[PDB]
């Protein structure tokens, strides 16, 4: 069967790639082609013949779409099922098609981008040469010019997972804060009605403010508008979880809170809001 | 009492009207309990906060926050120190025309 199933890997789609996904259960065992040479497989590789096509598929997609796009999606999902790592050579040629399809916007491309962001974010190995371009493309397309809300929600998910880990330090504070501020700026401007991704971003910033405070305290300076917006949001649970952290940061004394709200708090970032109700919140919670 | 204040605040959240009034009616109550040492500094630093520079986006807000804040401040018993220039500025920019004239 190793000689035959390879034919299906040639992207004879006819909606059979979903059936090729069935072979993922087999790859969950070892998939030893990445951690070592390809010759470490024992009479089930002829994963050499499959990795070969998975690598060569970049040809048509980079030399120029939905067909080859879904083919790449499924083949990289199957190959990256068990072993999350893969050689940099294929990334360097595949991530070009990402931007090429991104700038082509002028339906399945959304799912392709979702899968690609899922597969690429597992490991970061570039020496800040192309990774810069990766983060720039992210912040300029998935946040600024993303037409669909699902891809924005997915990038919010990936950056949440990035800020969530604590062990190993794959992300860095600079690009993290850049992504966070670009989100704060655009996510609420271009998607005000879709409260789902807004609540997700607000939960992300609430976690950033709540957990890992001993490590990060400079990032809070730029994200003041995000915190204020989450405090004045129309959702009661988000407002409550934001006020519970806004209150504990100050002494439970009426004079201290009054001085704070009168000289240390800047309401400019609020924006045409009746912020005095937050003053009522703060003055009545200390009772 | 904790069950009353939480629901009171959650009710003031949704209604901008009848919540401005709560601040107008509660702030002077707070001023009453503040000692002279606290009241002096608070009144001396409120004017910088009445200006507060870029806190002007409320210029087009119907119930501008500065309106409610200066109303509450004026409704206190001892609030002597307030500059007339800032009063006229608030009256012109914000919807404080007649209140500012009465104070002046």
């Amino acid at each position: 069967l190793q000689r035959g199933i390879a034919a299906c890997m040639t992207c004879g789609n006819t909606k059979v790639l979903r059936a090729v996904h069935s072979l993922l259960s087999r790859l969950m065992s070892i998939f030893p082609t990445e951690p070592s040479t390809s010759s470490v497989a024992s009479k089930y590789e002829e994963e050499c013949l499959y990795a070969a096509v998975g690598k060569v598929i970049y040809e048509g997609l980079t030399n120029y779409n939905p067909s080859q796009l879904f083919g790449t999606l499924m083949i990289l999902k199957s190959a990256c099922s068990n072993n999350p790592s893969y050689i940099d050579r294929l990334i360097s040629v595949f991530m070009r098609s990402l931007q090429k399809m991104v700038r082509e916007h002028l339906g399945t491309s959304e799912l392709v981008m979702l899968s690609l962001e899922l597969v690429k974010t597992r490991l970061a190995v570039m020496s800040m040469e192309m990774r810069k371009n990766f983060i720039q493309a992210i912040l300029t397309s998935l946040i600024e010019k993303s037409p669909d809300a699902k891809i924005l929600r997915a990038v919010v998910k990936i950056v949440e997972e990035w800020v969530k880990n604590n062990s190993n330090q794959t992300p860095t504070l600079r690009e993290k804060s850049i992504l966070l501020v670009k989100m704060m700026t655009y996510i609420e401007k271009r998607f005000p009605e879709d409260l789902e991704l807004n609540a997700q971003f607000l939960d992300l910033v609430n976690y950033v403010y709540r957990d890992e405070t001993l490590s990060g305290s400079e990032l809070t300076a730029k994200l003041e508008p995000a915190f204020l917006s989450g405090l004045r949001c129309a959702q009661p649970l988000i407002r409550a979880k934001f006020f519970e952290v806004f209150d504990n940061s100050m002494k439970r004394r009426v004079y201290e809170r009054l001085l704070y709200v009168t000289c240390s708090q800047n309401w400019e970032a609020m924006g045409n809001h009746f912020w005095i109700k937050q003053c009522i919140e703060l003055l009545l919670a200390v009772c | 009492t904790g069950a009353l204040l939480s629901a009171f605040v959650q009710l003031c959240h949704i209604s901008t009207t009848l919540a401005e009034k709560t601040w107008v009616q509660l702030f002077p109550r707070l001023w009453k309990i503040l000692s002279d040492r606290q009241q002096h500094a608070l009144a001396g630093e409120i004017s910088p906060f009445l200006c507060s520079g870029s806190h002007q986006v409320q210029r087009d807000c119907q119930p501008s926050a500065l309106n409610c804040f200066v109303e509450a401040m004026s409704q206190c018993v001892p609030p002597i120190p307030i500059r007339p220039c800032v009063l006229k500025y608030l009256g012109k920019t914000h919807n404080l025309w007649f209140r500012s004239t009465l104070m002046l």
Partner: peptide
């Protein structure tokens, strides 16, 4: 810049 933070509870000028 000093270890400042707009979210912190820095309340200056209590008697100045």
């Amino acid at each position: 810049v000093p270890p400042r933070s707009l979210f912190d509870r820095a309340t200056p000028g209590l008697l100045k």
